[PDB]
């Protein structure tokens, strides 16, 4: 909203807000640090803190939690925000935070996860918890991570590189692969994730990189699609924003491309 970002131009965000599509009642949990909700430019619907030591989601002690929330909210200006904290200030959690964060999101209906955050190694509990969300019928949206390349191997963080997420890869503003955007065959899409500003806590602003932001725009877009298509099932969400991206090259580095909202919302299943 108040800091000026290419980003919501690149993913053809405006397109919608022309047609008067703005993410109007879409529930989006951002699972991260917290939202500081006392930020002018913020609005936050409700939460749920899951870090024993930071027991308030609505403060933001890292600051990821307050720009993905921003990022969200310039994509889809309507969408409501639940902050579930299940990282603490230094963006670190167990993996036990994040699935009770998944637990209350199903529990609260969201319409949207965007998961601002990935660990090296996997959990079948994990999966069971975004799997079961999916299966909830939430639109499961994860930042790819920042590990950059490992050669043929992924490096697609967990839970990103799990079937039922869509994984969510950064480019800049010239849609080149960010040199931090983890690759590998469970890459779905690219977003914006380079210099990206936003909101930060203690009513302040500014950039930041990474696939946590290149995620957020895929959570907005997600809401976007949402206000167009209430009827829509997680399922033909996702088809939506993978069968309309703008293709940037080797799927292992760009997944389907850069999503292009204003495609995805008149798709033809």
Not at 38 to 65: I, K, R, W, Y
Not at 105 to 132: R, T
Request: aromatic share 6%.
């Amino acid at each position: 909203a108040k800091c000026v970002s290419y980003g919501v131009s690149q993913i053809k965000a405006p397109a919608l807000h022309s047609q008067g599509y703005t993410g109007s009642n879409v529930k989006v949990a951002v699972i991260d640090s917290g939202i500081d909700s006392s930020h002018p430019d913020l609005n936050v619907a409700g939460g749920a803190s899951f870090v024993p030591s930071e027991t308030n989601p609505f403060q933001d002690n890292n600051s990821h939690g307050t720009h993905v929330a921003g990022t969200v909210l310039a994509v889809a200006p309507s969408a409501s925000l639940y902050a579930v904290k299940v990282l603490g200030a230094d963006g670190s959690g167990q993996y036990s935070w994040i699935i009770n964060g998944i637990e209350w999101a199903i529990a609260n209906n969201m319409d949207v996860i965007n998961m601002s955050l990935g660990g090296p190694s996997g959990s079948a509990a994990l999966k069971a918890a975004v799997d079961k969300a999916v299966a909830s019928g939430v639109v499961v949206v994860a930042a790819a991570g920042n590990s950059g390349t490992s050669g043929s191997s992924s490096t697609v963080s967990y839970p990103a590189k799990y079937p039922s997420v869509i994984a969510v890869g950064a480019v800049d503003s010239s849609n080149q692969r960010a040199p931090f955007s983890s690759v590998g065959p469970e890459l779905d899409v690219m977003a914006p994730g380079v210099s990206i500003c936003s909101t930060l806590p203690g009513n302040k602003y500014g950039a930041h990189s990474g696939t946590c932001p290149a995620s957020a725009h895929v959570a907005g877009a997600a809401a976007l699609i949402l206000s167009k298509h209430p009827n829509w099932t997680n399922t033909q969400v996702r088809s939506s924003l993978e069968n309309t991206a703008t293709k940037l090259g080797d799927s292992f580095y760009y997944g389907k491309g850069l999503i292009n909202v204003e495609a995805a919302a008149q798709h033809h299943h």
